[PDB]
Design a protein around this ligand. Structure first.
Ligand SMILES: [Ca+2]
Ligand SMILES: [Ca+2]
Lengths: 670, 401
């Protein structure tokens, strides 16, 4: 009683060792009676003399390269199989044979050609002892024959010939006629694998029982180099019954090398191909909703990833806790991911960036600001000698450039800059330098989050002559704060008569939604200028929710929708990031150049990076999609270059578009 | 092998002197028969790219797996938070010595203290009081108009509060970053700017504050002087915790108006012989002899590193003497199941309530886990040579003129 059965239960890429030894590994062993199969080496060691049966099915996932899989007996190939189609989802290298083995003989599968980048999930390797030898029984009947040569057929419409007979227990297989004559009544098993090199013609191979076909198989379709017509069956045969293979259709030009034909007497009478990880701040509930919506939308799209569903893992972290970010990111990489999406502040960005670079996991970083405060650059140190796996999805912070340009247009010479309590003033360090260089008089003040006590304190604290100085100074101001704080701040100064009809204030923030803009205008009493980021979105409200054939959930694209009107900017980028990845994976899959995800280990100074990471990164980096933000793509420096600002105004006595800004064309309009 | 007293250390690749002094401190303590009388201190040191917070975390985790009683770090803010957050998770007391980039004046890290959670990070260097000190001095001189110059590594958030206050008092304050190559900066300037701008610029430079490392300041002072952008009536202030005696002498030499120098100072004994002792504890002469080239070239972090090793040794000693030792544990980092060091809470409390006299003066921690002790001296010279004008500390305030 000897039998084994092993399968590949995971999509994961081959190990370093598998690449070096070329021995095909099977991690899950379903059967191992006698423990004669070494699961670690994936090799079967024959415990005794007898005839053994082997069958294997090696699956080639989205791979362009042709592969050759051979069954090895002590370092010598017995049977080989090919799965070299060049444009196919999944193709299998399958074959089987009966061989005689001595005690201690080693059987295993070797990858003679190509590689298993895309992994080989569902691949199988099993085998068993048909009967022992030396230990006697007329119930020992088996044969096995292969075609060892490329030679053309012998004036063959006719019977498929096999010149090399490996097994012939009972001498019931007539090698000259390639016909099996059943010596007795019983159930018989037959398997055949006929390889037909693309002779520009389809073939039909049938197993014949006394001139009548039992089972049939077809090959010779497609332009695949080597393809096999395979099938198998159990049939009852009487004494003298003749079983053989007939070529019912087509021809075997190019020879049929590697073709196999065997048979014997039985007795006489989860884990997906596409997985991404995501790390979100605890404040990023909307990022998570939109992320999931994007995945959902793409999974409904029959034109993108047509036969593969996207799965994901999400973890929320305290974005002020960079170790937890790293910790949770590491856990995702252990599961195995193709990419990491993050939506987090700068505090944890660097830890994640540095992790991504170490593990070669492409990292798509969406910067979030604190409490809607205007963004300031993170200052993520790019890798010089090393390759940088982090892609910055949001564009560079151009706030300082834009505000300077606008201020220059208005010919301001004296003004005050107000910023909220979360803003990072390094964002305007360059701005402050330039205004000083031009000799302007620029005051700075942080605005506390409670305006009421700030301004009340002010009147008490400051004397008259100070307030008069202060009033004058407020005639021209810039607010670098979140709209909520600005709303409260504008109202309180207005109501307390610290500004008047002649004032002119500028508010600048990437993120100010339509509801905020309307409310700011309502609250202000002089001239107001509002500077915010804008996203090129189609005319005809119907086409807003599509990009080509891709349908976007109406909740994100209907600008009458409360969600849409309340979305954070990061939410839009998250959608396009999922969108961009899907197209990147699609192209990689379509081109048949897939490299599988790997289960990585973080805190192991020995641990290696993902061997697939470099090619995936390059593919993602050169990707581009049309989405909610407009165009998302990356330049040579790994960052999104596309950004647009609109400039709104109203002199009171109602808001309108004054102009537009972008970093290539510059300012347009007044 | 495996000793009873083991500590870990993480150093920036730039922190070679921290490492030397760390090892010297351990060496000195091991010779001291009055501290840890029957136990030798052993340690593990790892250098990391301080701009690589994952590597910091990675290497820190490896140390914790070996098993340590405490983690000493000498690193910038970039990796501090990762280490702080790790320390809190693993309950490993973490003694953090902030290093600035290229001798640039320090700005606060903004390390988020744990509210509901206990914070295992101790800040060994005092809070950054630069903004308070510079404001106080400027107020004393009755300045109303001046320019602030800062180097290319300085974090201007350090002066955000200062900028707020000068604006509130109605002053006219200009800001400029000074590029690391002054020669092309000033050459560019004369070409670029026209006459009437330079006249405006010259006037503005009559009163200036430099918030930069002394090397850049040296070059900057010389180039402006030689190019006649300042004159005898100017008054410049230089402020940096770290300006050694050699730097001060050289700055004075290069300046041609009034110069004020503001730097941190360390209360160190009279009688040069007793400088190298604290009680029975002997300090290597290379650190305490102020004629020694090393001593004169030490970074401030180097002094704190010495006192940190010193402080830990006394903390371990007291814990051992009181017969209340809790052993180090081999911890695992990336294991969401992994537990913290059960000894960490008591060790942290002991270290936190510790205090030693060392090279920095007194090192100790307040209720908030941070060193409160700091002193600034204020030096001056009107040209035609440097002398002490006054002193500043955050409790008594300004003393002298
Ligand atoms: Ca209004
Ligand atoms: Ca001089």
């Amino acid at each position: 009683k000897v039998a084994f059965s092993a399968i590949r239960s995971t999509n994961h890429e081959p190990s370093e060792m598998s690449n070096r030894t070329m021995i095909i590994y099977f991690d899950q062993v379903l059967v191992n009676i006698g423990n004669n199969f070494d699961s670690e080496r994936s090799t079967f060691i024959a415990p005794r003399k007898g005839i053994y049966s082997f069958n294997f099915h090696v699956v080639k996932v989205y791979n362009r390269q042709t592969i050759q899989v051979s069954l090895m007996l002590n370092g010598w190939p017995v049977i080989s199989a090919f799965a070299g189609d060049q444009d196919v989802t999944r193709e299998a290298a399958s074959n089987g044979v009966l061989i005689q083995m001595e005690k201690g003989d080693r059987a295993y599968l070797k990858l003679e050609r190509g590689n298993l980048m895309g992994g080989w999930k569902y691949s199988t390797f099993s085998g068993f002892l048909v009967f022992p030898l030396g230990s006697s029984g007329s119930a020992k009947v088996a044969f096995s024959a292969i075609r060892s040569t490329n030679h053309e057929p012998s004036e063959m419409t006719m019977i498929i010939y096999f010149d090399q007979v490996l097994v012939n227990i009972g001498n019931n297989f007539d090698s000259e006629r390639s016909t099996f004559i059943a010596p007795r009544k019983g159930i018989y098993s037959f398997n055949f694998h006929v390889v037909k090199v693309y002779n520009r013609q389809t073939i039909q191979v049938s197993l014949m029982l006394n001139g009548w076909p039992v089972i049939s198989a077809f090959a010779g379709d497609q332009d695949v180099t080597r393809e096999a017509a395979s099938n198998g069956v159990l049939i009852q045969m009487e004494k003298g019954d003749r079983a053989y293979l007939k070529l019912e259709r087509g021809n075997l030009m190019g020879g049929w090398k590697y073709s196999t034909f065997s048979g014997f007497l039985v007795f006489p009478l989860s884990d997906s191909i596409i997985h991404i990880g995501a790390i979100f701040d605890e404040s990023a509930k909307k990022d998570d909703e939109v992320f999931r919506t994007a995945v959902g939308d793409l999974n409904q799209n029959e034109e993108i990833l047509q036969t593969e569903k996207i799965t994901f893992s999400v973890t929320f972290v305290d974005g002020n806790n960079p170790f937890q970010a790293v910790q949770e990111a590491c856990e995702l990489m252990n599961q195995g991911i193709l990419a990491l999406v993050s939506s987090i502040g700068c505090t944890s960005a660097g830890s994640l960036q540095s992790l991504a670079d170490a593990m070669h996991i492409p990292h798509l970083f969406i910067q979030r600001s604190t409490a809607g405060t205007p963004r300031s650059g993170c200052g993520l140190t790019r890798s010089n000698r090393n390759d940088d796996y982090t892609l910055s999805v949001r564009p560079p912070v151009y706030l300082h450039d834009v505000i300077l340009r606008v201020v220059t247009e208005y010919a301001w010479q004296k003004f005050i800059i107000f910023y909220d309590s979360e803003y990072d003033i390094r964002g305007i360090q360059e701005f402050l330098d330039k205004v000083s260089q031009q000799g302007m008089d620029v005051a700075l003040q942080k605005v506390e989050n409670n305006i009421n006590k700030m301004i009340t304190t002010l009147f008490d604290t400051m004397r008259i002559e100070e307030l008069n100085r202060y009033r004058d100074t407020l005639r021209r101001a810039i607010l670098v704060m979140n709209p909520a704080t600005a709303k409260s701040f504008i109202t309180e100064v207005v109501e307390t008569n610290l500004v008047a009809f002649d004032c002119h204030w500028i508010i600048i923030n990437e993120e100010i939604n339509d509801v905020d803009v309307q409310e700011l205008v309502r609250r202000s009493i002089g001239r107001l200028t509002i500077i915010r980021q804008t996203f090129p979105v189609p005319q005809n409200i119907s086409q807003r929710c599509f990009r080509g054939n891709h349908r976007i959930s109406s909740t994100l694209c209907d600008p009458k929708d409360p969600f849409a009107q309340n979305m954070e900017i990061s939410n839009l980028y998250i959608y396009d990031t999922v969108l961009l990845l899907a197209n990147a994976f699609h192209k990689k899959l379509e081109d048949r150049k897939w490299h599988s995800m790997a289960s990585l280990s973080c805190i192991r100074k020995n641990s290696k990076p993902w061997q697939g990471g470099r090619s995936m990164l390059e593919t993602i980096k050169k990707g581009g999609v049309s989405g909610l933000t407009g165009e998302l793509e990356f330049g040579e420096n790994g960052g999104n270059p596309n950004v647009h600002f609109e400039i709104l105004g109203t002199n009171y006595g109602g808001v309108r578009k004054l102009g537009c800004w972008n970093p290539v064309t510059g300012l347009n309009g007044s």
